[PDB]
C-alpha cells in the first residue's frame, strides 16, 4: 500500500522471524505403529523455506524418536502447514482412509484411526 509492488519481486519471499524462542511441533505416529524414514525424508524434502523446497538449510531441524516426529524452528510458521504436508504425504502413499490427524495439545498433532 505504502510502496507499489513489482512483479519481478515474486522471486524472493522473506519469511517473518520470531523475536526469540524456537517453537516446537510434534506429530505422533504411535497408533499406526520403516515408514518413519520415508515420512522424515518427505518432510525434509517438501518443507518450504523462504520459497524453495528441499534445501531448508539449518533454520529447521527434524528428528524421529519414540514414534514421534519433532520439528524445531526459529522461523515463523503455521501449525496448519504440517497438517497440510502430512495430508499430502498420506494421499501420495494412499492411506487417506482409516487414518486422520487431530490436534491434541497446543503444539502437537496426533494420528488416529477412523
Amino acid at each position: 500500500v505504502a510502496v507499489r509492488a513489482k512483479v519481478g519481486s515474486r522471486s524472493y519471499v522473506r519469511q517473518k522471524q520470531l523475536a526469540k524462542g524456537k517453537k516446537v511441533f510434534k506429530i505422533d505416529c504411535s497408533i499406526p505403529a520403516d515408514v518413519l524414514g520415508n515420512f522424515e525424508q518427505f518432510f525434509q524434502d517438501n518443507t518450504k523455506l523462504n520459497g524453495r523446497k528441499g534445501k531448508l538449510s539449518d533454520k529447521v531441524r527434524l528428528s524421529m524418536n519414540d514414534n514421534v516426529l519433532t520439528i524445531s524452528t526459529t522461523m515463523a510458521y503455521r501449525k496448519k502447514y504440517f497438517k497440510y504436508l502430512t495430508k499430502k504425504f498420506l494421499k501420495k502413499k494412499d492411506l487417506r482412509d482409516w487414518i486422520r490427524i487431530l490436534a491434541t495439545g497446543k503444539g502437537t498433532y496426533q494420528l488416529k484411526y477412523f
Partner: protein, 63 residues
C-alpha cells in the same frame, strides 16, 4: 489474484472505464480532502510557532 493485479494498476484503462469521471471519483471529495489537509498543516505550523497570526490569516484565506 485480479485484485493484486489491479493494485499494480493493470485493468483500468480508457477502454475499460464505463462511468463518468465524477461517478468514478467525485470532485467534491477531492476538494474536501485537499482543503482539510491544508488547514491541518496551517494549524500545526501556527502551534509550533513557525508562523505568526498575521501570516496565518493570509494563508488561510488564499488556501
Amino acid at each position: 489474484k485480479m485484485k493484486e493485479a489491479k493494485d499494480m494498476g493493470r485493468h483500468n484503462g480508457v477502454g475499460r472505464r464505463e462511468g463518468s469521471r465524477e461517478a468514478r471519483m467525485p470532485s467534491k471529495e477531492l476538494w474536501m480532502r485537499r482543503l482539510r489537509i491544508l488547514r491541518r498543516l496551517l494549524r500545526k505550523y501556527r502551534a509550533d510557532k513557525k508562523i505568526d497570526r498575521h501570516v496565518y490569516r493570509d494563508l488561510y484565506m488564499r488556501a
